Amino acid sequence: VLMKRSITAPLAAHISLVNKAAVDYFFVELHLEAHYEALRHFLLMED
Amino acid sequence: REIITLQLGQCGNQIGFEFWKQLCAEHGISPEGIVEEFATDRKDVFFYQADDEHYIPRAVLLDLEPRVIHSILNSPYAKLYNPENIYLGNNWASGFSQGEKIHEDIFDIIDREADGSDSLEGFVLCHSIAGGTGSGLGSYLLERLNDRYPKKLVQTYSVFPNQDEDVVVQPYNSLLTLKRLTQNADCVVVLDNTALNRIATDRLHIQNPSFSQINQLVSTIMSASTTTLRYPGYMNNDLIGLIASLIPTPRLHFLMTGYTPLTTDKTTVLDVMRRLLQPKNVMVSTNHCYIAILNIIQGEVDPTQVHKSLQRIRERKLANFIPWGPASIQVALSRKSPYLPSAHRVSGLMMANHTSISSLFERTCRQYDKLRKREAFLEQFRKEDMFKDNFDEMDTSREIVQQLIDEYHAATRPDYISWG
Numbered sequence: 001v002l003m004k005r006s007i008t009a010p011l012a013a014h015i016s017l018v019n020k021a022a023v024d025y026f027f028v029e030l031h032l033e034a035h036y037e038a039l040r041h042f043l044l045m046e047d
Numbered sequence: 048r049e050i051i052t053l054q055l056g057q058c059g060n061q062i063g064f065e066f067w068k069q070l071c072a073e074h075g076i077s078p079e080g081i082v083e084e085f086a087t088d089r090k091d092v093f094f095y096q097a098d099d100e101h102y103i104p105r106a107v108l109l110d111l112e113p114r115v116i117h118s119i120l121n122s123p124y125a126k127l128y129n130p131e132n133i134y135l136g137n138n139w140a141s142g143f144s145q146g147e148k149i150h151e152d153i154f155d156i157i158d159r160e161a162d163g164s165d166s167l168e169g170f171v172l173c174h175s176i177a178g179g180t181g182s183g184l185g186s187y188l189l190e191r192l193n194d195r196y197p198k199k200l201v202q203t204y205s206v207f208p209n210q211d212e213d214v215v216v217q218p219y220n221s222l223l224t225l226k227r228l229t230q231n232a233d234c235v236v237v238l239d240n241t242a243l244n245r246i247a248t249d250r251l252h253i254q255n256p257s258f259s260q261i262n263q264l265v266s267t268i269m270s271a272s273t274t275t276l277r278y279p280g281y282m283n284n285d286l287i288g289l290i291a292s293l294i295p296t297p298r299l300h301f302l303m304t305g306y307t308p309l310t311t312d313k314t315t316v317l318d319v320m321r322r323l324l325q326p327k328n329v330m331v332s333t334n335h336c337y338i339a340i341l342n343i344i345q346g347e348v349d350p351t352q353v354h355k356s357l358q359r360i361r362e363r364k365l366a367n368f369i370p371w372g373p374a375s376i377q378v379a380l381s382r383k384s385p386y387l388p389s390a391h392r393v394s395g396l397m398m399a400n401h402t403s404i405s406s407l408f409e410r411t412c413r414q415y416d417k418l419r420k421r422e423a424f425l426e427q428f429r430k431e432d433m434f435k436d437n438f439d440e441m442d443t444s445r446e447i448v449q450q451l452i453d454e455y456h457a458a459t460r461p462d463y464i465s466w467g
Contacts, residue, residue, distance in 0.1 A: 047279075
């Protein structure tokens, strides 16, 4: 219908994929999941 | 912290050798000591960091008239340990008299192993009551550890002689060694021949080779009790802080030891806690109730189930205790060992003080008294005569264990401002 949300449907599929790639780029490359259990490992006495 | 196994008795040396081969299979090590290629974690609780990453186990072998050292000699476990730690009767009094004359060099062995370790905190004993050579020599070693080291721990993983009334000299020896364990040892983990033998006949189809499977059971129990010390958790990994919660009553330091897999060949923590509080899963043999309970769960565990399990266990009144304080059931978590060769990695353990063990102690309080009245089973050995002329040490042991019974029954009461 008349709206600017018909334009976004073949574009938001790439924008959301870029966002998911950013979060996965955090986890599997910068090891963001290991950093939580590393700071835990000294700050709530987990060593 | 770091503890050194002092094995004594025939079954004590058997469970010591079984414990070291169990830890050799458990850790990623060779039977020479060399680190493997599938093995950072801590390997410093029982092993010295020796020469080529040789995790040499720190142990003391004591006996009389050697039997099992030949089986050690023709095995690859004379190449894992023994850089010089192996030292070469049938009654408590003969063992006491034999340990009296050679107390100097065995105390030198204890000093040598204490100097060998890097942080001495306790002396753990892998011992069998009335194993033959263990009786008497073990009690004298306990007296030596109490006199020389009041600042360190004495831990005793031990089996106690119950045959359901076999041998007619073992109640005297076990009662005297039990009095020595009360006055000269700091914590006792109690096990029984009938309980382990009955569970062995239940889970398997054996009755005659009880010793070789009792070695496996005691080794699994000892590895489970030291799993959180050997492999790093972050709760009370020193022995002092771990046994600090385990003993609620300062004279009643005999702990129940259950194990939810009887054979290790899914489940929630609620179901294994309901299993684990039942005495049929416990390898230990009126109003009886616990004083304080603690359990350790290691495996593929979800921690919010440890929450809900603790909630439902204490509220449905299956943790049975009437204390003189607030002393309660405790949850504890452990990490299951990486590179166990064992499958089915969910396993549970309980360390709790129960007054029901007093009834089993009362059987020994019967037996010696019965064998004192018939007077053909004290046997009138001359070593017992030179131990004590009046034979009042056995009456002293009976008095001490009678105080222990009255202290169990007073700990059932909400008052411990009065015991008998």
